[PDB]
Amino acid sequence: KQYIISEELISEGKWVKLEKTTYMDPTGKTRTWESVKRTTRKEQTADGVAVIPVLQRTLHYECIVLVKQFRPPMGGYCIEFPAGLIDDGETPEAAALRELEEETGYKGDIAECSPAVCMDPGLSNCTIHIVTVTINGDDAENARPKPKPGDGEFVEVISLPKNDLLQRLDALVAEEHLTVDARVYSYALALKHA
Amino acid sequence: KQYIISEELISEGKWVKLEKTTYMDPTGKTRTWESVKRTTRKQTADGVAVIPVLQRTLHYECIVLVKQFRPPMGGYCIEFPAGLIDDGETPEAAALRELEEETGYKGDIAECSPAVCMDPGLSNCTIHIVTVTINGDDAENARPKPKPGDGEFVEVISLPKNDLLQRLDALVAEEHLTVDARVYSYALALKHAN
Ligand SMILES: c1n[nH]c(-c2nccs2)n1
Ligand SMILES: c1n[nH]c(-c2nccs2)n1
Ligand SMILES: [Cl-]
Ligand SMILES: [Mg+2]
Ligand SMILES: [Mg+2]
Ligand SMILES: [Mg+2]
Numbered sequence: 170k171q172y173i174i175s176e177e178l179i180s181e182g183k184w185v186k187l188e189k190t191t192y193m194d195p196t197g198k199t200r201t202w203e204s205v206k207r208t209t210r211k212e213q214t215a216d217g218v219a220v221i222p223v224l225q226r227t228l229h230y231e232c233i234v235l236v237k238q239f240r241p242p243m244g245g246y247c248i249e250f251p252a253g254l255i256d257d258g259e260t261p262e263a264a265a266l267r268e269l270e271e272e273t274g275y276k277g278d279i280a281e282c283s284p285a286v287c288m289d290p291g292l293s294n295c296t297i298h299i300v301t302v303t304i305n306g307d308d309a310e311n312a313r314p315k316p317k318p319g320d321g322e323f324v325e326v327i328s329l330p331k332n333d334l335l336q337r338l339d340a341l342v343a344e345e346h347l348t349v350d351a352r353v354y355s356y357a358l359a360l361k362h363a
Numbered sequence: 364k365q366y367i368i369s370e371e372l373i374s375e376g377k378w379v380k381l382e383k384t385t386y387m388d389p390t391g392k393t394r395t396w397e398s399v400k401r402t403t404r405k406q407t408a409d410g411v412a413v414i415p416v417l418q419r420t421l422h423y424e425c426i427v428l429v430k431q432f433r434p435p436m437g438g439y440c441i442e443f444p445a446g447l448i449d450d451g452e453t454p455e456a457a458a459l460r461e462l463e464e465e466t467g468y469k470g471d472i473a474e475c476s477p478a479v480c481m482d483p484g485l486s487n488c489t490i491h492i493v494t495v496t497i498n499g500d501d502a503e504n505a506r507p508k509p510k511p512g513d514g515e516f517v518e519v520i521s522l523p524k525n526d527l528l529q530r531l532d533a534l535v536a537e538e539h540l541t542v543d544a545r546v547y548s549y550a551l552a553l554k555h556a557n
């Protein structure tokens with residue numbers, strides 16, 4: 170029933186733009202919406218990837234590898250899955266493995282790749298692939314993992330056991346001012362609920 | 364170590380604004396970011412998203428989701444029930460209220476996250492994730508009456524919790540919908556548990 174009629178640019182920054190969206194509602198009436206989009210999306214199947222990195226080591230419990238970094242939009246530190254935008258011509262898998270290595274030092278193995286999923290669909294058109302990757306932490310490559318941060322990238326690695334993820338996240342939030350990402354919290358809540 | 368120095372308004376709509384954030388990087392170098400904010404926040408968070416666990420004896424437990432046209436996305440998305448928290452509303456009350464308006468179900472609160480970020484590289488948007496159980500055998504949830512406000516047009520989709528990820532992949536392959544990243548993350552973790 171519903172569809173886009175027009176998209177009018179309101180303001181276009183270097184990285185983000187705002188649009189006035191006109192659409193047809195299902196009563197047959199015309200309505201508008203204020204829409205955010207990135208300026209960086211070309212032919213990628215999504216804007217970005219977020220990596221679910223399951224660190225596996227003999228005689229260790231499985232960990233989920235997370236990162237902490239300052240996020241200017243939030244004005245503070247956030248704890249997230251490793252993530253980045255997909256470079257033009259780059260596959261989501263390759264982007265995932267690359268971002269994981271850049272942010273954490275770890276060299277992973279692909280497990281699964283989601284279809285493009287929406288980040289905040291009432292606000293923006295932004296999408297990611299969620300890429301599950303296993304890290305063989307017994308491999309020598311993954312012994313002394315050092316982030317290769319890019320220019321203006323400053324990332325801390327936090328590995329938490331999968332079997333206690335939600336409480337460990339709660340214990341981090343209780344100890345400093347910091348925000349957990351909604352996807353990370355959602356993933357931790359399901360681990361509890363299962 | 365990092366912090367915000369200043370925020371310049373670039374453009375302000377009715378619902379969304381775009382800012383240029385200046386911040387201090389951890390080397391002591393001054394940097395800028397293009398940040399989105401909502402104009403509606405006053406609250407612990409912008410919104411709530413509800414994880415509604417539909418419990419009916421002798422049935423599988425279902426997670427109740429919603430399908431709506433999302434003008435920023437140009438298409439239909441499958442999401443947790445959700446909405447913005449009203450001025451002077453608690454996150455718990457917003458959750459039960461939105462769950463009722465969007466699904467017709469009357470639920471009980473199980474737990475409530477701290478404020479969690481939606482897309483912290485882009486926006487300051489936050490939500491509380493509120494887990495709610497729904498006693499599907501109670502008479503008030505027999506014929507769930509959805510109360511859509513002005514301009515809401517929501518379809519309800521209940522899916523079994525124990526197969527959620529495969530059920531969502533099936534809808535994406537057949538119905539050309541976009542699944543929400545929080546929904547998908549929850550689904551993934553139900554599979555990855557144990
Ligand atoms: C975010 N962008 N536009 C919106 C709207 N809410 C009601 C009408 S337009 N939210
Ligand atoms: C989204 N908003 N601002 C951005 C930037 N990326 C690199 C420098 S500023 N992305
Ligand atoms: Cl539950
Ligand atoms: Mg990143
Ligand atoms: Mg990066
Ligand atoms: Mg809603």
Ligand SMILES: [Mg+2]
Pocket residue numbers: 446447461464512
């Ligand atoms: Mg509403």
